[PDB]
């Protein structure tokens, strides 16, 4: 941490005033409840003493009813100035912090972004580390003066009234705090232990969706739902006991309060009888000391912030204060008037600052001339990217100056030097602004005509008109995701707009298609003419058209010559030597009321049939727990009545009766509060386990095209099965325990307030709207009115995010002072939208507190108007007021659950969209053709016109007809690999064929059952995916009823028994993501053994590669020989001539099969065939 008193370093003369008004208001607001209690204690004491006198009672109750309208106006004018002068002054400072932080973040050197601080941290330090500072001075400092004023003003009111009953209360509050603090730890120790197994069992649905290709091929979707069901019971038994320690931890706080109010009342009755204390001052002393001791523990959340945002504000001040010794642009430089471009290199050796021991360049010299197109060779391995990272002074050479027209760049203007070099990055960089500014960064002086004049050269203007708004489309998260082929054209448009002379096009050469190439190359060609350009070249056309090309020799240059100068050498043609494997890597790579929630809620509640014995047993024990909170507010209001009884021997025999009920119903709040929170947690944890294992047996039943729509991703399923049933519980299952309780609490209060006196119980109900609307706002004050704190600063913070990740493209165009003027404008609406929110959160909070204390004066006044006419008494108008103001902590708390019943509808929307989505093919479709036993194995793949459901752009196969006879081996040799996989993928009905019928043994695959035919066909995947279990179970995962004798023999045929016999852990080695990491060169032999146990008649084989261990290759071939022995096998051939012994061989030619027969048959009459020509070449 830095210090406190250092956070307020961005304060002008206007927030020194907003922190005075907001600190006087927050202090006056705090001292209003302990003063209201004093005024209330003086009102009652003037209302029960005058029983024989009437005309004075209405004279000293009217007086004190005019102090409530003043206390309610000193809260309206004090909550206006607390919530408005703190939110508004915590914004103007934390915005100037962000802007000053970013202005000095993309102004440091690039060395600072590699060693000292990482680029993935300076971008994170404005997402939450710049919010922790705002939240630590905006509102959690105003919620500290408040709760210190209430603490200090609680004891003073309690001690200047009865110093004798306010010591007992101080000797009692700790006994409540101990029990209230032990409960919080005993519950939160298990609320963190349950969400350890609830996260460990979430890995099964994560390892199943990833390997969904081999889950069904060895069909075991029944093994992944009974290994997921019996892995939630462990986290269910850890939740059955977090519903018991909650009941015994909340029922032990009602056994302490109810028993500690049985001593305070008796002791107050002991003092009243001795004439040491009034009657109403013994109820405004317990409360005024229990409020001034409970508003001290509410100052701890506001205290943790000052320590969490004091060590998280040193990071931000680290970069602001970072020294400018970063070699910033020297102002005292020189500028040359005749730049034509003669950049050369003379003895340049440079070393990275992150590892100042190794060398990259050793005596490197380059002689780039004027107005030519010299290129570079030396593809990856040397790096070939330091040269462009050194010309524009991104780093500095260790020795040897870099020349420019006879002048070094160690004295020239950096801004002018960068103004004359146009950089085109390999990856386009576009900022989230209009296209009229993203192209404007090149030279902020041109007009509208010249912008399109420069854009049309890159063939961009031909399509900008087609845009809905022309040159105003906000690219980035709003510009409809422009194609990658247009990002390059707008980038080169920006490049030509600066019309430089030291042009430095890099190698885009990554994913640009041949369609867009015809025009982007033409756009580039008009831009390389007549300027000194250095082109790093990867495409052959660029090299053949360019001038003489230099050869990089990992530190120096051997010789510089044209294509003819170097290609004519031959064997000593190092250029031609490096050319040959350059192209080899290319081809191989490729509303809620009864309308919107009436069906869904009842649909959810109907499948909970067999657990209702726990429903109406924590619900008949929840009424009798809300009725004991209205039989306590009645006792506390009936003891107060008897305090004003002139008898001193009848009061004793009345307080001694209420002090035996309070202990009596204190044992009924320890039991009947355990049946409440312990039978509504058995319901809630049998509902979740049921709704989760219905959302897995439905996921594992969809079609293969469902899993590759980019929405059913590996993490998107493990997250939508976790935060979709755990927020139906915590928002709907723990909320029916609060609606029923606070309904008994209301039906007892509004029925015990009418038996005594009903005339007062209508004026006390006609003002409920202005009381339950005042308590809700009081209960929302603690959470702060400044919500959505992260989302408000989100449209501008991503412009900041995509400005310190591309800092080299930002500082290459000198445009490091414009990305701050664009960032200032993106934070201006949040200022004049948060200025108008703190004054509707302070003018709608002040009136709803004036109107709360203006209803106690339409109360205690009408009550004193009844009494003058003998319609009631003091003991019948104070037991109706207080027992019916306790119903204002009923409906007012019940109505607070509005946010928890609007997201609970969205939850069951997603839950119930998964349980009804119709599958494409039913795995358990009835009345299918029964599969005969030990089928011959005649696979017949013909007329397989087919393209992928995902996108039918490129048709996969065009009318192939393969024919493998029962008991033989057929291969799929051919060129352009990784294009034949859509044959194994359709033998298993993963993707439905478009036009054709796939038949097995003369019967079609459509009329079979899907799961009745996968018990005969086994595949070996390309890369063997291995589950996180033991070897014995993983190998036995294949065949049901895997006996030990069969598995030990099946593993023997593959040459892996001896290799794993030497392991210390025997067979159960526990291979996985956390077990013993085995070598990847022997993973194939577990998969082959797993496929062998299936005794499958058809044994489709994908590959046997990724076995670079030469010793392992012979073992793999030994297993392959047994694999193709006595059973049909469709083996995809991604191997060399080693496949000599195949019986039928076939060739795939761009989705067409051309020749059939055998191996030796094609070599005698097909001299021009591809098959014969690849024999000796590849």
Curated annotation (Swiss-Prot):
The reaction(s) annotated as catalysed by this protein in its Swiss-Prot or TrEMBL entry are:
(indol-3-yl)acetate(in) + ATP + H2O = (indol-3-yl)acetate(out) + ADP + phosphate + H(+); brassinolide(in) + ATP + H2O = brassinolide(out) + ADP + phosphate + H(+); 24-epi-brassinolide(in) + ATP + H2O = 24-epi-brassinolide(out) + ADP + phosphate + H(+); 24-epi-castasterone(in) + ATP + H2O = 24-epi-castasterone(out) + ADP + phosphate + H(+)
Q: Which GO terms describe its molecular function?
A: ABC-type transporter activity; ATP binding; ATP hydrolysis activity; ATPase-coupled transmembrane transporter activity; auxin efflux transmembrane transporter activity; auxin influx transmembrane transporter activity
Q: What is the effect of changing residue 40 to A?
A: Reduced brassinolide-triggered ATPase activity and altered brassinosteroid exporter activity
Predominant place of localization = membrane
Residues involved in ATP 1 binding: 114, 352, 354-355, 383-386
What keywords appear on the UniProt entry? ATP-binding, Auxin signaling pathway, Brassinosteroid signaling pathway, Cell membrane, Glycoprotein, Membrane, Nucleotide-binding, Repeat, Transmembrane, Transmembrane helix, Transport
Give the protein's recorded name. Answer: ABC transporter B family member 1
Species whose genome carries this gene: Arabidopsis thaliana
**Which gene name belongs to this protein?**
ABCB1
């Amino acid at each position: 941490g830095v210090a406190f008193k250092e956070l307020f370093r961005f304060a002008d003369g206007l927030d020194y005033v907003l922190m005075g008004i907001g600190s006087v208001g927050a202090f006056v607001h705090g001292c209003s409840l302990p003063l209201f209690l004093r005024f209330f204690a003086d009102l009652v004491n003037s209302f029960g003493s005058n029983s024989n006198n009437v005309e004075k009672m209405m004279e000293e109750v009217l007086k004190y009813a005019l102090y409530f309208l003043v206390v309610g106006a000193a809260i309206w004018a004090s909550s206006w100035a607390e919530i408005s002068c703190w939110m508004w002054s915590g914004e103007r400072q934390t915005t100037k912090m962000r802007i000053k932080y970013l202005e000095a973040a993309l102004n440091q050197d690039i060395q600072f972004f590699d060693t000292e601080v990482r680029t993935s941290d300076v971008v994170f330090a404005i997402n939450t580390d710049a919010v922790m500072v705002q939240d630590a001075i905006s509102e959690k400092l105003g919620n500290f003066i408040h709760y210190m004023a209430t603490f200090v003003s609680g004891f003073i009111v309690g001690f200047t009234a009865v110093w004798q009953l306010a010591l007992v209360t101080l000797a009692v509050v700790p006994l409540i705090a101990v029990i209230g603090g032990i409960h919080t730890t005993t519950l939160s120790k298990l609320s963190n232990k349950s969400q350890e197994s609830l996260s460990q069992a979430g890995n099964i649905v994560e390892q199943t969706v990833v390997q969904i290709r081999v889950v069904m091929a060895f069909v075991g979707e029944s093994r992944a739902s009974q290994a997921y069901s019996s892995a939630l019971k462990i986290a269910q038994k850890l939740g059955y006991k977090t519903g018991l320690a909650k009941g015994m931890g909340l029922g032990a706080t009602y056994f302490v309060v109810f028993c500690c109010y049985a001593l305070l009342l008796w002791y107050g009755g002991y003092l009243v009888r001795h004439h040491l204390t009034n009657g109403g001052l013994a109820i405004a002393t317990m409360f005024a000391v229990m409020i001034g001791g409970l508003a001290l523990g509410q100052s701890a959340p506001s205290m943790a912030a000052f320590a969490k945002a004091k060590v998280a504000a040193a990071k931000i001040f680290r970069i602001i204060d970072h020294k400018p010794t970063i070699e910033r642009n020297s102002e005292s430089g020189v500028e040359l008037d005749s730049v034509t471009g003669l950049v050369e290199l003379k003895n340049v050796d440079f070393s990275y600052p992150s590892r100042p021991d190794v060398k990259i360049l050793n005596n490197f010299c380059l002689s780039v001339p004027a107005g030519k197109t010299i290129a570079l060779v030396g593809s990856s391995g040397s790096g070939k990217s330091t040269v462009v990272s050194l010309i524009e002074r991104f780093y500095d050479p260790n020795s040897g100056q870099v020349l420019l027209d006879g002048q070094d760049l160690k004295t020239l203007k950096l801004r002018w030097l960068r103004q004359q070099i146009g950089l085109v990055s390999q990856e386009p960089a576009l900022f989230a602004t209009s296209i009229k500014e993203n192209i404007l960064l090149g030279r902020p002086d041109a007009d509208q005509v010249e912008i399109e004049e420069a854009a049309r050269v890159a063939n961009a203007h031909s399509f900008i008109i087609k845009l809905p708004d022309g040159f105003d489309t906000q690219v980035g998260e709003r510009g409809l995701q422009l194609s990658g082929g247009q990002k390059q054209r707008i980038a080169i448009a920006r490049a030509m707009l600066k019309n430089p002379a030291i042009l430095l096009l890099d190698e885009a050469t990554s994913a640009l298609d041949s369609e867009s190439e015809k025009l982007v190359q033409e756009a580039l060609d008009r831009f390389m003419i007549g300027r000194t350009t250095l082109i790093i070249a990867h495409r052959l056309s660029t090299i053949r058209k360019a001038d003489l090309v230099a050869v990089l020799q990992q530190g120096s240059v051997s010789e510089i010559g044209t294509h003819d100068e170097l290609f004519s050498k031959g064997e000593n043609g190092v250029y031609a030597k490096l050319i040959k494997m350059q192209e080899a890597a290319h081809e191989t790579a490729m509303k809620l009321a009864f309308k919107d929630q009436a069906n869904s809620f009842w649909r959810l509640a109907k499948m909970n049939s067999p657990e209702w014995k726990y429903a109406l047993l924590g619900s008949v024990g929840s009424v009798i727990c809300g009725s004991l909170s209205a039989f306590f507010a009645y006792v506390l209001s009936a003891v107060l009545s008897v305090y004003y009884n002139p008898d001193h021997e009848y009061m004793i025999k009345q307080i001694d009766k209420y002090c035996y009920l309070l202990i009596g119903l204190s044992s009924a709040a320890l039991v009947f509060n355990t049946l409440q929170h312990s039978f509504w947690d058995i319901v809630g944890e049998n509902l979740t386990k049921r709704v989760r294992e219905k959302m897995l047996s439905a996921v594992l039943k969809n079609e293969m095209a469902w899993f590759d729509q980019e929405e059913n991703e590996s993490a998107r399923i493990a997250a939508r099965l976790a935060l979709d049933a755990n927020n139906v519980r915590s928002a709907i299952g723990d909320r029916i325990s609060v609606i029923v309780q606070n309904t008994a609490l209301m039906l007892v209060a509004c029925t015990a307030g009418f038996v005594l006196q009903w005339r007062l119980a209508l004026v006390l109900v006609a003002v409920f709207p202005v009381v339950v609307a005042a308590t809700v706002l009081q209960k929302m004050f603690m959470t702060g009115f400044s919500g959505d704190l992260e989302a408000a600063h989100a449209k501008g913070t991503q412009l900041a995010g995509e400005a310190i990740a591309n800092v080299r493209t930002v500082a290459a165009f000198n445009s490091e002072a414009k990305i701050v003027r664009l960032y200032t404008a993106n934070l201006e609406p949040p200022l004049k939208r948060c200025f108008w929110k703190g004054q509707i959160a302070g003018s709608g909070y002040g009136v709803a507190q004036f109107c709360l204390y203006a209803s106690y004066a339409l109360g205690l006044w009408y009550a004193s108007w009844l009494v003058k006419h003998g319609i009631s008494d003091f003991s019948k108008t104070i037991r109706v007021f207080m027992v019916l103001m306790v119903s204002a902590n009923g409906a007012a708390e019940t109505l607070t659950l509005a946010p928890d019943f609007i997201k609970g509808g969205q939850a069951m929307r997603s839950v119930f969209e998964l349980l009804d989505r119709k599958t494409e093919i039913e795995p358990d479709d009835p009345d299918t053709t029964p599969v005969p036993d030990r089928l011959r194995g005649e696979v017949e793949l013909k007329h397989i016109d087919f393209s992928y459901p995902s996108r039918p752009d490129i048709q996969i196969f065009r009318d192939l007809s393969l024919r493998a006879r029962a008991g033989k081996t057929l291969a799929l040799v051919g060129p352009s690999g990784c294009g034949k996989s859509s044959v194994i993928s359709l033998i298993q009905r993963f993707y439905e064929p478009s036009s054709g019928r796939v038949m097995i043994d003369g019967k079609d695959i459509r009329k079979y059952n899907l799961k009745a035919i996968r018990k005969h066909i086994a595949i070996v995947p390309q890369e063997p995916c291995l589950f996180g279990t033991t070897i014995y179970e993983n190998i036995a995962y294949g065949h049901e009823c895997a006996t030990e004798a069969e598995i030990i023999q099946a593993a023997t045929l593959a040459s892996a028994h001896k290799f794993i016999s030497a392991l210390p852990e025997g067979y159960k080695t526990y291979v996985g993501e956390r077990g013993v990491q085995l070598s990847g060169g022997q993973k194939q032999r577990i998969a082959i053994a797993r496929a062998l146990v299936r005794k499958a008649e058809i044994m489709l084989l994908d590959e046997a590669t990724s076995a670079l261990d030469a010793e392992s290759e012979r073992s793999v071939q030994e297993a392959l020989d047994q694999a193709c022995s006595g059973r049909t096998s469709i083996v995809v051939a991604h191997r060399l001539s080693t496949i000599r012994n195949a019986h039928v061989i076939a060739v795939i030619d761009d989705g067409k099969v051309a020749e059939q027969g055998s191996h030796s048959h094609l070599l005698k009459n097909h001299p021009d065939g591809i098959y014969a020509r690849m024999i000796q070449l590849q």
